[PDB]
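Why do we bother with a discrete structure alphabet at all? Because it lets us treat a fold like text: something you can write down, compare, and reason about line by line. To make this less abstract, here is a complete entry for Ma1120. Read it the way you would read a sentence in a foreign language you are learning: slowly, and without expecting to understand everything at once.
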Amino acid sequence: VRSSIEELADWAEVERPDLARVTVVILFTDIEESTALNERIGDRAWVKLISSHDKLVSDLVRRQSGHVVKSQGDGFMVAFARPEQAVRCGIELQRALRREIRVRIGIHMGRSVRDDLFGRNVAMAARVAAQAAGGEILVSQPVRDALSSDGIRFDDGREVELKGFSGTYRLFAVLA
């Protein structure tokens, strides 16, 4: 029962796409309960839904100077030069969707501490997104701290353990 986010993250670990034409902040998004939704409405409706969704997402990403690295149906991997753009993009996407399909959105950015920085950051971003509820924007501590000028507000954060990662991580949801 792998999500499109997980499929893209596994792809990205091996592909190692060159983001020299963007730089880094990584955003992952997919549709909550996509498989169940697909099985409910059937493939022809799904194709229509996905093409429409793809148009929405790609346009909003580009409007925020983002670069869709790869998409897998409902899933998107997106790169931004700055965390402000990534979060604003997420805010705009959630608003458009409310204006019933709901998307998970996770955002992460990271620095080297010694190493394989890209491998860790992409994997981390995917897990953050995997932790997000439909309709939620979740960001890692570094993104939260990097945006601590508004008007972007966060909750008090939640401590979670991410699959395959040692330690615990505090994740913050973006608020209205």
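What the structure line is telling us, in plain words: Strands lie at 25-31, 67-72, 75-80, 103-109, 137-139, 158-160, 169-173. The chain has one domain: 1-176.
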